[PDB]
Amino acid sequence: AISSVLNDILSRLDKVEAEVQIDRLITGRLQSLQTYVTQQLIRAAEIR
Amino acid sequence: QCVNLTTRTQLPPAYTNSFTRGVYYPDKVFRSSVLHSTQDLFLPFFSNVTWFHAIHKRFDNPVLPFNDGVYFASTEKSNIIRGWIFGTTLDSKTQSLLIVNNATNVVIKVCEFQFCNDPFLGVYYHKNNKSWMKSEFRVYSSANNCTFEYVSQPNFKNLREFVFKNIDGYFKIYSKHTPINLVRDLPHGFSALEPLVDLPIGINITRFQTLLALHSGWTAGAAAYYVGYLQPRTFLLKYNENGTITDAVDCA
Amino acid sequence: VSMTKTSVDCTMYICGDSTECSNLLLQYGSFCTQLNRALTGIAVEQDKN
Amino acid sequence: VTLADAGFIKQYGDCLGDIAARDLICAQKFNGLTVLPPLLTDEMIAQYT
Amino acid sequence: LDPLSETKCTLKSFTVEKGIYQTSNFRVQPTESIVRFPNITNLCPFGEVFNATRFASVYAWNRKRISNCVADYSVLYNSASFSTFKCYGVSPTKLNDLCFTNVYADSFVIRGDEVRQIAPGQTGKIADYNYKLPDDFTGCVIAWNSNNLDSKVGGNYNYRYRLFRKSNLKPFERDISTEIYQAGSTPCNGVQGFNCYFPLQSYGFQPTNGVGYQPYRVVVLSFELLHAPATVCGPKKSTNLVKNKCVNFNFNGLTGTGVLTESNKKFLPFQQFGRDIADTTDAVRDPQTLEILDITPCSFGGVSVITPGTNTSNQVAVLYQGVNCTEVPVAIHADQLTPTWRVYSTGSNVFQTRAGCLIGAEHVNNSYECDIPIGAGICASYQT
Amino acid sequence: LCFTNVYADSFVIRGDEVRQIAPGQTGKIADYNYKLPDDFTGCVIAWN
Numbered sequence A: 001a002i003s004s005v006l007n008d009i010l011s012r013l014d015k016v017e018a019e020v021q022i023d024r025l026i027t028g029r030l031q032s033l034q035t036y037v038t039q040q041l042i043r044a045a046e047i048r
Numbered sequence B: 001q002c003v004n005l006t007t008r009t010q011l012p013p014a015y016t017n018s019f020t021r022g023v024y025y026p027d028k029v030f031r032s033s034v035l036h037s038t039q040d041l042f043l044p045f046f047s048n049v050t051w052f053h054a055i056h057k058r059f060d061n062p063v064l065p066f067n068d069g070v071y072f073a074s075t076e077k078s079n080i081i082r083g084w085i086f087g088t089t090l091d092s093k094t095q096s097l098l099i100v101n102n103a104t105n106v107v108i109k110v111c112e113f114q115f116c117n118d119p120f121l122g123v124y125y126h127k128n129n130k131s132w133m134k135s136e137f138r139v140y141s142s143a144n145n146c147t148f149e150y151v152s153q154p155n156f157k158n159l160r161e162f163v164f165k166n167i168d169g170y171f172k173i174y175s176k177h178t179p180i181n182l183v184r185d186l187p188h189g190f191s192a193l194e195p196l197v198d199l200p201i202g203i204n205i206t207r208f209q210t211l212l213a214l215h216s217g218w219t220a221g222a223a224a225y226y227v228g229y230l231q232p233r234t235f236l237l238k239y240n241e242n243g244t245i246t247d248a249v250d251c252a
Numbered sequence C: 001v002s003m004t005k006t007s008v009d010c011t012m013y014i015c016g017d018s019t020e021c022s023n024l025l026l027q028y029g030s031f032c033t034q035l036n037r038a039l040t041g042i043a044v045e046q047d048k049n
Numbered sequence D: 001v002t003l004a005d006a007g008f009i010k011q012y013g014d015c016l017g018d019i020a021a022r023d024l025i026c027a028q029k030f031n032g033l034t035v036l037p038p039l040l041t042d043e044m045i046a047q048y049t
Numbered sequence E: 001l002d003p004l005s006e007t008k009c010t011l012k013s014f015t016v017e018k019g020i021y022q023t024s025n026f027r028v029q030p031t032e033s034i035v036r037f038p039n040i041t042n043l044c045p046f047g048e049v050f051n052a053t054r055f056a057s058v059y060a061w062n063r064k065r066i067s068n069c070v071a072d073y074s075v076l077y078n079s080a081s082f083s084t085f086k087c088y089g090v091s092p093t094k095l096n097d098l099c100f101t102n103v104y105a106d107s108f109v110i111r112g113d114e115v116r117q118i119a120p121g122q123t124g125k126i127a128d129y130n131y132k133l134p135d136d137f138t139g140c141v142i143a144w145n146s147n148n149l150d151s152k153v154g155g156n157y158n159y160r161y162r163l164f165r166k167s168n169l170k171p172f173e174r175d176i177s178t179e180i181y182q183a184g185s186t187p188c189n190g191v192q193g194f195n196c197y198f199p200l201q202s203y204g205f206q207p208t209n210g211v212g213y214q215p216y217r218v219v220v221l222s223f224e225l226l227h228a229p230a231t232v233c234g235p236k237k238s239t240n241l242v243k244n245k246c247v248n249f250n251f252n253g254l255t256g257t258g259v260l261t262e263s264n265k266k267f268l269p270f271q272q273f274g275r276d277i278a279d280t281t282d283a284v285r286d287p288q289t290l291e292i293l294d295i296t297p298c299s300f301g302g303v304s305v306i307t308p309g310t311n312t313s314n315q316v317a318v319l320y321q322g323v324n325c326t327e328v329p330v331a332i333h334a335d336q337l338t339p340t341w342r343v344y345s346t347g348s349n350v351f352q353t354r355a356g357c358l359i360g361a362e363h364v365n366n367s368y369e370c371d372i373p374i375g376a377g378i379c380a381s382y383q384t
Numbered sequence F: 001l002c003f004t005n006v007y008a009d010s011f012v013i014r015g016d017e018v019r020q021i022a023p024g025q026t027g028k029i030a031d032y033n034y035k036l037p038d039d040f041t042g043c044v045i046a047w048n
């Protein structure tokens, strides 16, 4: 995407193409959560 | 006016260890209590800076290449380093940049200059009035076309340092200073350099040339100056609780 | 015996205060509720341990 | 053992101004990552011991 | 409707078993808005960038620097005279809603057919030897026909470009060298003999030469954006600043939400913003008055709802996780909140736990076995 | 294919702004007299 920050994208771009920059940040961050949560579930199994 | 200098000395490219200097703020953003990591043109730690020193007997201003960007520093009193030429030719076959200081202003000017072959700014010293008069401007014979101009304002050695970069059409300047009580070694310690000026010059640069003061029939001032190229190298930087870079790691 | 319990608001993490980002995040369906249920499962188990 | 966040409340003044530079715990909280306290306090667990 | 209804929805069920349940986090909505821009007033000199007499040729494109001024762009974007107004990192509809560091208008003329060569990363002799835009170029390009302004019946010959070069030039380099170029190996240093060329060439702009072969005037606007001490900003009116409330702030196109506070951070004169580990701004220097404002996101947290089974009772209690409730009473629903319900904040049955603020449960001194857990040694149960 | 209802909207405009009739566009036609919705489903047909 053109920036790390959602507000920069909504400051610069209109809906038709702001949604393409935002789709990248949603996809990357949802992959960052699923990675953290999988790592934590595997750790939780070790602590158990 | 334009005149060639009497001394024709050459040979030893003197060197010194650039221990911990030539770090500078990578962008205009505040950060504090963080170990931030940045990839940029920087001065590689402990690299050989070329050292130049004027005696009384010795006066050297060689043409120095300018590849990716350069670090410059000087140890002074009585204001002897006064500017830089930059360009790809330096003979009015192509556009070139002039950066200079005098008795009342800094000037910045980019033109089809036909520079002098060994340029300087000249001075008359202690002429009855217990004052020194900046009086010769031996930088160029002609300045045919120009495409930008700017002007504004003019017990220890004065340590000065600068970093110069040309990239994405913009030429950029960073600087800092401190008073020092050391003979020749660049002192062990840290400071980043703040950004001062950005110039939209849009030219090739391949080389540069420092302009000393004269201080024929003259005496050279006891100033020294140090040059090193930058390289693209990742650096990791400790911003303290005040947001000043207090220590640095050269990642390579 | 245990580790720090964490809850992450999947909406604030992905989209923090952007409503248009939130309306795009709904197009990915159930994942934020599934991530809340996964971390709540870990967090309850710290007391059980 | 040096903990990072026990979960025992945050009240703004503990982070704003100075502390948000050196402290990462409130920068996590600002991005929707929240620690939850254990059900048993360190006094309760000690009492069990 | 109420916290029970929020759990019935979250649990996808018309009945709920005994427990404590996560629900939508609460978050204080911003109570008003701020805008701040420099109190500069002089309207930027776009006239001598669009209605200049004679433009410069693309071999020596005339850069004009625009700074320390106010720019309305809607007066350009509304004008039908532009035959193209294509943007490469901002939407033109939002230029009036943005701040620029420095704007360089780079200006020249070309034949219409060549207008395509002006997009970023393009190629062809205009894009290769006389005017290259950088790969990550951020800006707009605006172009229109001037066959009715600067064509001649004999062809205008002031408008020249370049046809040869030892290499394709760097982005935003201009080359005004004039060396005779050799198409064979010939070191023809003297003059433009056979297979040797003056590397400049002329258009001949003539009032019937052809559609698109006719002359177009072009400007490239090239701005640095939203992260430096800016001097070319939009015409939107600045408001007064306010502090300690949650607010929809904008400074210099840094739109965001948060509570502003007087900071003690020692910025240097070149720094406009300070940033978090998360790459999000968390201190700012106001452009009206040189003071550093701390930005903190205004209060929010997980809401957990505590219930006996719905076949035991409809009554519930609410836990606001990590919240010192000296705040939730002040967050009165006279404006909006993320949770639409508020009846529980009617109060007097409000208790502080180290886990957060517990609302709608009666605190009692006698201890019991833990029925529903809360945290930090506290539990809750449904009893007489 | 088959359609719930079809509405044909009809008007005359200049050739230049035939680009303003795309969904989510802006400019005086798209702004002050005929706007297609952000998620419009349909076609635009135009001729001199």
Ligand SMILES: *[C@@H]1O[C@H](CO)[C@@H](O[C@@H]2O[C@H](CO)[C@@H](O[C@H]3O[C@H](CO)[C@@H](O)[C@H](O)[C@@H]3O)[C@H](O)[C@H]2NC(C)=O)[C@H](O)[C@H]1NC(C)=O
Binding pocket: B088, B089, B204, B205, B206, E166, E167, E169, E170
């Ligand atoms: C910026 O100006 C530079 C100095 O004029 C210019 O450097 C020149 O580059 C060419 C192309 O490589 C060199 O030409 C020689 O190239 C190789 C050896 O490198 C030989 O095989 C060829 O026969 C030919 O002789 C020039 O020698 C070189 N000039 C100097 C003094 O080094 C840059 O190309 C310019 N950069 C831009 C972006 O225009």
Ligand SMILES: *[C@@H]1O[C@H](CO)[C@@H](O[C@@H]2O[C@H](CO)[C@@H](O[C@H]3O[C@H](CO)[C@@H](O)[C@H](O)[C@@H]3O)[C@H](O)[C@H]2NC(C)=O)[C@H](O)[C@H]1NC(C)=O
Binding pocket: B102, B103, B104, B105, B107
């Ligand atoms: C330091 O070096 C400067 C040149 O690089 C030099 O600038 C020159 O200053 C004079 C005096 O103002 C200018 O002369 C013109 O001044 C005004 C301008 O409006 C006119 O009314 C006059 O008729 C005259 O044309 C020069 O043009 C200017 N040179 C440049 C290149 O701009 C400084 O004066 C030097 N400092 C000292 C102490 O001499």
Ligand SMILES: *[C@@H]1O[C@H](CO)[C@@H](O[C@@H]2O[C@H](CO)[C@@H](O[C@H]3O[C@H](CO)[C@@H](O)[C@H](O)[C@@H]3O)[C@H](O)[C@H]2NC(C)=O)[C@H](O)[C@H]1NC(C)=O
Binding pocket: B144, B145, E060, E176
């Ligand atoms: C860079 O400097 C050059 C010298 O100052 C300048 O060259 C001059 O360019 C003009 C055109 O702009 C020529 O004007 C002539 O035009 C026709 C040519 O056939 C004649 O009929 C006219 O009488 C007139 O002489 C000059 O002759 C020419 N002079 C020289 C010595 O080359 C460049 O134009 C400048 N370039 C830039 C980009 O600034």
Ligand SMILES: *[C@@H]1O[C@H](CO)[C@@H](O[C@@H]2O[C@H](CO)[C@@H](O[C@H]3O[C@H](CO)[C@@H](O)[C@H](O)[C@@H]3O)[C@H](O)[C@H]2NC(C)=O)[C@H](O)[C@H]1NC(C)=O
Binding pocket: B240, B241, B242
């Ligand atoms: C971050 O910047 C701070 C502000 O400049 C700086 O604080 C300054 O520290 C010196 C050294 O302690 C103080 O000097 C005084 O120290 C004590 C009294 O506090 C006296 O014994 C001394 O004689 C002298 O008066 C400065 O007064 C103090 N500045 C302020 C405004 O309090 C910090 O040291 C910097 N932090 C780091 C990590 O370098």
Ligand SMILES: *[C@@H]1O[C@H](CO)[C@@H](O[C@@H]2O[C@H](CO)[C@@H](O[C@H]3O[C@H](CO)[C@@H](O)[C@H](O)[C@@H]3O)[C@H](O)[C@H]2NC(C)=O)[C@H](O)[C@H]1NC(C)=O
Binding pocket: E046, E047, E048, E050, E051
């Ligand atoms: C470049 O030159 C253009 C030609 O002069 C100029 O266009 C003109 O713009 C003005 C407004 O600034 C228009 O004036 C009319 O505007 C409304 C119409 O109701 C009234 O408020 C005014 O009193 C007046 O009637 C002109 O009609 C318009 N002319 C043309 C032929 O387009 C541009 O504004 C100039 N642009 C720049 C940046 O200088």
Ligand SMILES: *[C@@H]1O[C@H](CO)[C@@H](O[C@@H]2O[C@H](CO)[C@@H](O)[C@H](O)[C@H]2NC(C)=O)[C@H](O)[C@H]1NC(C)=O
Binding pocket: B002, B003, B004, B117
């Ligand atoms: C300064 O030194 C240069 C280099 O020796 C001199 O340049 C020469 O000038 C003559 C004409 O006077 C030319 O024929 C030569 O071809 C030039 N040589 C070079 C290498 O360019 C210059 O004349 C000297 N000027 C003074 C004032 O001494």
Ligand SMILES: *[C@@H]1O[C@H](CO)[C@@H](O[C@@H]2O[C@H](CO)[C@@H](O)[C@H](O)[C@H]2NC(C)=O)[C@H](O)[C@H]1NC(C)=O
Binding pocket: D009, D011, E324, E326, E352
């Ligand atoms: C909840 O927040 C209030 C402030 O709004 C806290 O009260 C302050 O507490 C400190 C420490 O005892 C005192 O210095 C202040 O003077 C108090 N101010 C007021 C207005 O009471 C309170 O301690 C907080 N409680 C918890 C559990 O976080």
Ligand SMILES: *[C@@H]1O[C@H](CO)[C@@H](O)[C@H](O)[C@H]1NC(C)=O
Binding pocket: B015, B046, B047, B048
């Ligand atoms: C620096 O130059 C000296 C020669 O003066 C040489 O011995 C040394 O190896 C060089 N060191 C580096 C890091 O280039």
Ligand SMILES: *[C@@H]1O[C@H](CO)[C@@H](O)[C@H](O)[C@H]1NC(C)=O
Binding pocket: B127, B128, B129
């Ligand atoms: C000394 O200064 C005066 C101006 O105060 C000047 O007229 C005089 O020429 C100067 N002396 C010399 C030797 O030039």
Ligand SMILES: *[C@@H]1O[C@H](CO)[C@@H](O)[C@H](O)[C@H]1NC(C)=O
Binding pocket: E038, E039, E040, E287, E288, E289
């Ligand atoms: C804004 O206006 C105030 C006076 O109300 C002035 O002190 C300040 O310098 C102005 N700011 C700028 C950036 O011009």
Ligand SMILES: *[C@@H]1O[C@H](CO)[C@@H](O)[C@H](O)[C@H]1NC(C)=O
Binding pocket: E311, E312
């Ligand atoms: C729940 O209570 C209802 C009466 O409200 C009763 O009909 C039902 O049998 C009960 N179910 C259980 C599992 O207790």
Ligand SMILES: *[C@@H]1O[C@H](CO)[C@@H](O)[C@H](O)[C@H]1NC(C)=O
Binding pocket: E363, E364, E365
């Ligand atoms: C709990 O007991 C203390 C005295 O030990 C008393 O002050 C307090 O008011 C009691 N709280 C309740 C809820 O009865």
